[PDB]
Symmetry: C3
Subunit: 302 residues, 3 copies
């Protein structure tokens, strides 16, 4: 069998993503019913930069699959040497790293599945959790309208583009000039959207992006590695704040998503986070179920 | 109906008796209770690392069938209320080592799973449950025993021995020098609870009088900048004034030669090693009890 | 009678054979032995961190049904806030075995002298005995019977691997040669213990500065890093003396034609070992890395049942 990896959202076809999302709903209902790692078999969970929430969710999820997560947090060894030995110890490799080329290198030589837990360019597992949450609140994903606001070149904007159009969602990214999606990601999303009937829109007009939306999404304006980049990373993003005024422009039944943690008062307001349209708490919980589903699916296919 | 354990008197006398009985049952049959089978998660969070606390909780949770998710050294990148909401979706209880009591109260008022004070500046209520289990297995009934704590009367063990001790019906004496006495509000709460159980509260600077007739002698680390505590050293002369078959307690680590001597720590009155082991059983019992009530 | 494993010759030749057979059985059936079902605890304590040591022990302990409690070096070093004797006393109430990475051998001795559960040396300044059990399992897999094989170690002859290959190798009946420059020779006490154990097994001990002679006719060639982290500031040029002892293709071609190459990880490609040797058909480094899991599980199962 071909060893499958999940390094970016479009590594799953539309039909494969639907299978993983259906499995996430099944696992939420029956969380110890799938035990492919019974033994326990190991899963490596490796951090080039520590992420407590990522480690938390995978550590518990792997245990609930019957496995034992071995956490290695933040040189002496080539990536090829690491892939070779880990393939003897564990049944999958979950890795939080920086550049995408490193994930590609690991996945090219490892003989077990490699999962991008979180990287600079993509956050594929969080977007599976998002799609699971939208399906819970709204039903069918195909044809929904989703708008993301803020830094249009960060990992969530890229993954909402790719994962969203894979699900058949029309995705809009509202971002200031200078902060737009990577051209390669945008072109890949446009091509994938052709297969599903979705579309890709990029705009600097936050009000137009909010009008008619079914889902509004935002994220922190600045990652830790961007704090020293020299830019004023507040002034450009203020018009893109997800506040009550913006939300009132969307569909009456619109929901709001936000990868945690949120910086209340910056990209999102208290009234929105804590109001009836907020799905952020279900979204955070569903990271557990969606990651378990992804692991089960990759392991069975590999 | 979500019960928390932030300080010793969060359990009533009857509820404390239930937890202590459960701790004895779990010592006998350590994998017989599996409320966390799955595994279900328990968050174990440290604002300041404590290896011994982490060690005992991590193993005990595993023996309840659970998986402890340990977070070393909250409130860093998100509000405490946001943290409580999400944690309540991932785990069945929250074990937290933090400093001020206002942080514990804040987490407990929002979380919809039990919050346990693993160790704090003001109280050490899990360690006192382990002490009470140790006293009961060596002496039987707790009601009416005389317990004396020696040394720093302002620290968390003095407060918890006062509150947890009188909750069990024990007459508690704190022997301590002038600049290091119990917090007045803890003392008042312990005097109130002692009226319900027939116990009493005494605070004195006279170590000889506190040791005379004691059934349980307890001390703890003092931290010469420790001159005022040396008259309260738990040494062979003090122990010789106690009731026959008295026992000596000290939560670890102990600084031998400071607050306690080798002859007392390694002698026949010492229950320090059983006491350390019973932290495992008592914390498991607390978790089992809170989980079934919540 | 509580058994410990602080150094390779803590097992007799017959006992070592039992552990190695158990390691082969556990490789075939990795969750069939559950002496720690419960879970029972095992303490895994690091005075200095070693990721690969923790990785392998943590997973192996879970596969025995247990739960590893890992205590890293950030925690106050054992001996500082508390005597080793007090620590052993309390750990004995919490866990069924103590796995400890520490420095001087006297600390291990003090711990095992009072603990009432088995104490295992995970890695120390003087010995690396669990790694050599993994090596012996790997050699047996590739070669069959260990008795009478010729094994040569190259590089720093006074580090923990050289000492454990001497003691563990002669316990298995292997003729062990250490090839090292003057000033980097095995500890005399270890060499004398190996020489004594060797006359029980038909083995032999050789120490030489001649790398070519040590490679000629060898069945197994082994090396390790020339410097550990604690030696980087010892004042010595730790490259120039070891260059003649590099495991490269020319050295390997002197050995027996079916010789195998071992190196515990990490390895520094280009220094003590070359890419061609690491990645060629004689290399057993990857199987060796994997067998750390099985050999450590076997050692724990054996010590727990014997105690
Ligand atoms: C357990 C383990 C894990 C990774 C590596 B390696 O070097 O990436 C090595 C080991 N090992 O050899 O014990
Ligand atoms: C697993 C976990 C734990 C805590 C938080 B939070 O924001 O305190 C978030 C997550 N999460 O959404 O992955
Ligand atoms: C020991 C080690 C070293 C490096 C890496 B890595 O991914 O750069 C991983 C490990 N590991 O997973 O054990
Ligand atoms: C769990 C544990 C482990 C070790 C020690 B000790 O003092 O080395 C103490 C405890 N304890 O008292 O909880």
């Amino acid at each position: 069998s071909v060893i499958r990896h999940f390094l970016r959202d479009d590594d799953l076809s539309p039909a494969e993503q639907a299978e993983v999302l259906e499995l996430a709903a099944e696992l939420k209902k029956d969380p110890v019913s799938r035990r492919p790692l019974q033994g326990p078999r190991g899963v490596a969970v490796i951090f080039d930069k520590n992420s407590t929430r990522t480690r938390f969710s995978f550590e518990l999820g792997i245990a609930q699959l019957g496995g034992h997560a071995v956490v290695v947090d933040s040189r002496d060894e080539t990536l090829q040497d690491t892939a070779k030995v880990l393939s003897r110890y564990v049944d999958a490799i979950v890795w939080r790293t920086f550049g995408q080329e490193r994930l590609d290198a690991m996945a090219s030589v490892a003989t077990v599945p490699v999962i991008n837990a979180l990287s600079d360019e993509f956050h594929p597992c969080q977007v599976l959790a998002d799609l699971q949450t939208i399906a819970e609140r709204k039903g069918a994903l195909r044809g929904l309208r989703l708008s993301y606001f803020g830094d249009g070149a960060n990992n969530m904007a890229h993954s909402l583009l790719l994962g969203g159009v894979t699900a058949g969602i029309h995705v809009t990214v509202a971002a200031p000039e200078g902060f737009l999606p990577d051209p390669s990601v945008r072109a890949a999303a446009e091509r994938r959207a052709q297969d599903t009937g979705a579309s890709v829109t990029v705009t600097a007009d936050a009000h137009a992006a909010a009008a008619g939306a079914d889902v509004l999404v935002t994220d922190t304006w600045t990652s830790m590695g961007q704090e020293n980049d020299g830019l004023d990373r507040v002034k450009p993003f203020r018009p893109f704040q997800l506040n009550s005024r913006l939300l009132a422009l969307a569909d009456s039944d619109a929901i709001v998503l936000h990868c945690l943690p949120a910086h209340r008062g910056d990209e999102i307001t208290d009234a929105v986070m804590d109001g009836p349209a907020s799905a952020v708490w279900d979204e955070a919980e569903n990271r557990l179920h969606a990651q378990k589903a992804l692991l089960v699916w990759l392991l069975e296919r590999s």
